[PDB]
From a paper:
Rubella virus is an enveloped, positive-stranded RNA virus with virions ranging from 500 Å to 900 Å in diameter. The structural components of rubella virus are comprised of three proteins, glycoproteins E1 (58kDa), E2 (42–47kDa), and the capsid protein (31kDa). Instead, the structure of rubella virus, as shown here, has an irregular helical organization of its surface glycoproteins and a pseudo-tetrameric inner nucleocapsid arrangement.
The cryo-electron density from about 20 isolated tetrameric units seen in the tomograms of the in vitro assembled nucleocapsid cores were re-oriented to a common orientation and averaged. These best fitting conformations of the capsid protein are similar to the orientations of the capsid protein expected to be facing the viral membrane. As the N- and C-terminal domains of rubella capsid protein are similar in size, the remaining density of the averaged dumbbell shaped unit must be the location of the N-terminal domain of the capsid protein. Using these fitting results, it can be deduced that the disordered residues at the C-terminal end of the capsid protein, not seen in its crystal structure, likely correspond to the thin strips of density visible in the cross-section of rubella virion tomograms, linking the inner nucleocapsid shell to the membrane anchored E2 signal peptide in the viral membrane. The dumbbell shape of the capsid protein also accounts for the double-layer appearance seen in the in vitro nucleocapsids.
Author numbering:
A (entry chain A), B (entry chain B): 24 to 121
């Protein structure tokens, strides 16, 4: 059972990039578990692919904490995080709920 | 349909839920503010839906340190987080390539 939400992300400087990210959320209900009751999905299931470039993925999946701006209006509002990853500055807009 | 990575997110306790998240990446070219300075209409345009429930989204984006790194079908590296938010304990896996 499916849901989705969209992010945006872009870097600065020479060779700057700009991506849309559609996060497709799938509810797996109650999957099979081991003893104790632990799930090990990274090893159980096949990942999607082919992968985007390495540095783009590291940047999107970076922790960054400091919400530094709020974009958009009304019901479609986005939190901006602003961070560097090895000399490259990134901006990442995340949908923020109510 | 272009470039893709996978994440995993799950909770413990009664009402535990389990989710696969596929992150679809679409290269949009140059960062959205040009030197003129006009905006790319692609930015925040046509967000996907419907959106996942608020506690799920919040959990997915909660700041949390990496507990450990794991593999990963095909020796693919993931960062793991183990954290609590809203009284609920969550586990999270994020694709993190080098």
């Amino acid at each position: 059972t499916e849901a989705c939400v969209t992010s945006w992300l872009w870097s600065e400087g020479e060779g700057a990039v700009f991506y849309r990210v559609d996060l497709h959320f799938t509810n797996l209900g109650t999957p099979p578990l081991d003893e104790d009751g632990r799930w090990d999905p990274a090893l159980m299931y096949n990942p999607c692919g082919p992968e985007p470039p390495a540095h783009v993925v590291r940047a999107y999946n970076q922790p960054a904490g400091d919400v530094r701006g709020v974009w958009g209006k009304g019901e479609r509002t986005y939190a901006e995080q602003d961070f560097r990853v090895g000399g490259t500055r990134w901006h990442r807009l995340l949908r923020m709920p109510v």
